[PDB]
Amino acid sequence: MPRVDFPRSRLRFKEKLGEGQFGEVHLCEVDSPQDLVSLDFPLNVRKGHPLLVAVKILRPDATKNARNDFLKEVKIMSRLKDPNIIRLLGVCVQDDPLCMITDYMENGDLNQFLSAHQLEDPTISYPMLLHVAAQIASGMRYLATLNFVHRDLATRNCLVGENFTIKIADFGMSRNLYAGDYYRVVLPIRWMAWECILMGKFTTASDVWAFGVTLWEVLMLCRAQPFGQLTDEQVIENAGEFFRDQGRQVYLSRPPACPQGLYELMLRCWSRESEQRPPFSQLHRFLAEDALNTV
Numbered sequence: 001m002p003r004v005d006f007p008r009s010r011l012r013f014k015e016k017l018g019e020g021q022f023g024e025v026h027l028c029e030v031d032s033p034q035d036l037v038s039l040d041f042p043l044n045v046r047k048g049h050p051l052l053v054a055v056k057i058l059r060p061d062a063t064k065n066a067r068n069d070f071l072k073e074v075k076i077m078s079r080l081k082d083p084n085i086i087r088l089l090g091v092c093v094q095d096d097p098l099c100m101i102t103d104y105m106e107n108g109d110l111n112q113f114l115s116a117h118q119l120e121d122p123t124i125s126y127p128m129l130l131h132v133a134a135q136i137a138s139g140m141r142y143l144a145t146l147n148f149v150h151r152d153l154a155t156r157n158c159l160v161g162e163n164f165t166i167k168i169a170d171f172g173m174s175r176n177l178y179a180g181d182y183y184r185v186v187l188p189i190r191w192m193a194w195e196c197i198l199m200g201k202f203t204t205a206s207d208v209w210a211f212g213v214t215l216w217e218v219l220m221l222c223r224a225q226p227f228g229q230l231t232d233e234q235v236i237e238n239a240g241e242f243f244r245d246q247g248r249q250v251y252l253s254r255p256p257a258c259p260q261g262l263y264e265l266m267l268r269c270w271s272r273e274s275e276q277r278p279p280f281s282q283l284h285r286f287l288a289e290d291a292l293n294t295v
């Protein structure tokens with residue numbers, strides 16, 4: 001927990017960004033940010049331009065548990081300091097409503113971003129795609145080594161900042177745009193490891209499985225839903241065939257842009273045994289070095 005609250009009096013309401021069970025997210029502008037610039041709130045001020053922030057707000061009528069989940073997320077957010085994780089700029093916890101304030105990424109989520117691009121045969125290059133994926137891996141390595149499990153890694157939960165900087169995020173909002181990505185059994189089954197689906201065992205190993213699917217989205221430039229050839233029920237049945245491991249299961253196909261070695265890395269992310277899936281340190285090293293060095 002930060003010593004001091006960010007001052008609510010400085011948040012100028014622009015727009016409601018969304019909503020979930022917890023409450024809501026607003027886009028705010030920081031009023032006269034140059035006066036707030038300190039060691040405790042190091043803000044990137046640009047004279048003549050609004051400093052925009054996202055603010056996640058706990059509903060006033062929230063339950064004891066919801067309030068506790070929210071404060072747990074505050075404590076977690078306060079720790080995460082890494083170039084590829086969304087950054088906590090401040091909090092408002094003295095009074096209700098409880099708030100978390102983050103940087104605002106104007107390029108939106110990675111899925112929106114890549115969906116608007118096409119591959120360099122607005123364009124994006126294969127090296128840049130590897131750089132995107134390397135940043136996600138690096139963010140996930142940081143998370144894993146702080147003993148955190150994400151549980152919902154996907155391009156929809158990555159944000160694009162400036163100069164192709166990617167930040168892993170976790171919104172907790174219900175966004176109609178991605179409703180088809182979740183299945184009520186409410187779970188992101190197409191990104192989930194077989195053991196998650198069949199048992200509910202969530203681990204860094206299942207985050208690696210999700211990273212694999214996320215790597216596939218990126219290399220597909222987010223043009224198809226993973227396993228779009230399978231209905232939701234059939235995705236569940238497919239998990240059963242991974243457990244079966246008699247080779248009957250459906251694997252995501254090699255994207256056109258993906259060379260064989262990168263595809264086989266993805267395949268290892270989908271190894272039936274968790275311990276054979278590569279750690280994020282290895283995934284990052286392979287994307288930042290081996291894959292980049294063999295363009």
Ligand SMILES: CCN1CCN(Cc2ccc(C(=O)Nc3ccc(C)c(Oc4ccc5c(c4)CC(=O)N5)c3)cc2C(F)(F)F)CC1
Nearest residue numbers: 025054055056100102103104105148149150168169170171
């Ligand atoms: C087992 C469950 N895991 C535990 C570890 N958690 C880590 C975590 C938690 C919260 C967020 C998180 O992200 N929280 C958050 C905080 C504040 C706000 C305002 C918020 O959401 C925003 C909504 C819209 C926009 C932004 C933030 C920035 C923007 O440009 N738009 C989310 C991000 C992570 C991450 F990245 F490490 F994985 C993930 C769940």
